[PDB]
Design a protein around this ligand. Sequence first.
Ligand SMILES: CNc1cc(F)cc2c1[nH]c1nc(Oc3cnc(C)nc3)nc(N3C[C@@H]4[C@@H](N)[C@@H]4C3)c12
Ligand SMILES: [Zn+2]
Ligand SMILES: [Zn+2]
Ligand SMILES: [Zn+2]
Length: 183
Amino acid sequence: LEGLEAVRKRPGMYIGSTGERGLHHLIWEVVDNAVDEAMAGHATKVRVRLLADGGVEVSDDGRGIPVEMHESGVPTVDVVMTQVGVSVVNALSTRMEVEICRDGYQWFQTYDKSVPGTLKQGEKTRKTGTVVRFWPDPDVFETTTFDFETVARRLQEQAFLNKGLTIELIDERDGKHRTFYYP
Ligand SMILES: CNc1cc(F)cc2c1[nH]c1nc(Oc3cnc(C)nc3)nc(N3C[C@@H]4[C@@H](N)[C@@H]4C3)c12
Ligand SMILES: [Zn+2]
Ligand SMILES: [Zn+2]
Ligand SMILES: [Zn+2]
């Protein structure tokens, strides 16, 4: 967790600012990982929800973040959320939730002020994919309001670059919705 403490100590080092543009770094990172699964993991659908409480949910129907034991002796999902680019989202969020469908099972993990909980094996499923929820820390960010039009423009770009990918955007704050798809 030394990397995460470094991000929390100097957030602007990692996301440039703690204003609106800094806040949107977090949604870009999680969206990017979901969209990466379209080229790499045969995902057909990405969904982004702007939650009523300021949180964000991103989901894909890709391979699912690996849950197998990493060489560092913890589930790979914990390595991802502490070491890869998306670990900045974990560092600067009060909490994150991860749901994974892979290897014939649902899996659930939580991060509480970036600290991993205990990976839980849930029910059997033939489905695959990943859901990440995160709640930006208002102690870090001078604004916590995501901009629907800013997010829409990024998702339209990502649909155009990933032909056949459906991207759904839902604003739970006001009900606005958009679906992006290029054949
Ligand atoms: C909402 N969707 C979402 C959010 C998120 F924060 C991270 C991921 C994600 N979907 C993901 N899907 C996968 O499937 C993979 C990738 N590679 C292999 C070998 N197996 C399965 N892997 C993921 N990750 C591990 C590593 C990627 N290069 C990063 C992130 C993410
Ligand atoms: Zn990427
Ligand atoms: Zn493949
Ligand atoms: Zn596949």
